[model samples]
Target: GSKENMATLFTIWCTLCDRAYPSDCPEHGPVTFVPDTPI
Candidate 1:
């Protein structure tokens, strides 16, 4: 398939404060989810 789909960038999203961070979160635990896709 052609890599031309409109998409967005994201990373580790912990279930606290509703904040998103790249790589990992220090204050939060292992409960993050990559709720993203290449729309």
Candidate 2:
């Protein structure tokens, strides 16, 4: 039995906009939150 659809979600802090967005920031870009880390 094999069935999976995983999606790693993270919170990106935008210093330009002074807010937090789930995914990425198109304008200012991602300030923090590293993805696909080797754990």
Candidate 3:
């Protein structure tokens, strides 16, 4: 039998600075939470 591997990608954006980061963002400081969409 074989199993399927899958993962989801997303971009995290900082509403205050208007900057965006990846799902695995390393250095993301305090920022407001906003709506997010799947990519």
Candidate 4:
């Protein structure tokens, strides 16, 4: 069951700091990872 069914913006949270921030937060920071681009 994924959020595909629901039409809503997913929120991100910080593991180190207990705070609720948007997808892009200065303190909370955003994720930095290279997506798996299968070649």
Q: What TM-scores do the predictions have?
A: 0.39, 0.44, 0.28, 0.32
Worst 10 residues of 3 by lDDT: 1-10
Model 2 residue runs over 4 Å out of place are 1-10, 32-39
Error of 4 at 36 (Å): 23
Decide which is better by lDDT, 1 or 4.
1
Q: Looking at model 2, which ten-residue stretch has the lowest summed lDDT?
A: 1-10
Q: Pick the TM-score winner.
A: 2
* 1-39 per-residue lDDT for model 1 (tens digits): 233244323355565647646545678745535555678
Q: Model 1's lDDT to the true fold?
A: 0.51
**What does each candidate score in C-alpha RMSD?**
9.0, 9.3, 9.8, 7.3
Q: After superposition, how far is residue 8 of candidate 4 from its true place, in Å?
A: 6.8
Q: lDDT by residue for model 2 over 1-39, one digit each (tens)?
A: 122224324366566666656656789786644454596
- What's the number of clashes in each of the models? 0, 0, 0, 0
lDDT of each: 0.51, 0.56, 0.47, 0.48
Give lDDT: candidate 3, residue 22.
48
Ranked by lDDT, the better of candidates 3 and 4 is: 4
State the local distance difference test value for candidate 4.
0.48
Off by over 4 Å in 4: 1-10, 31-39
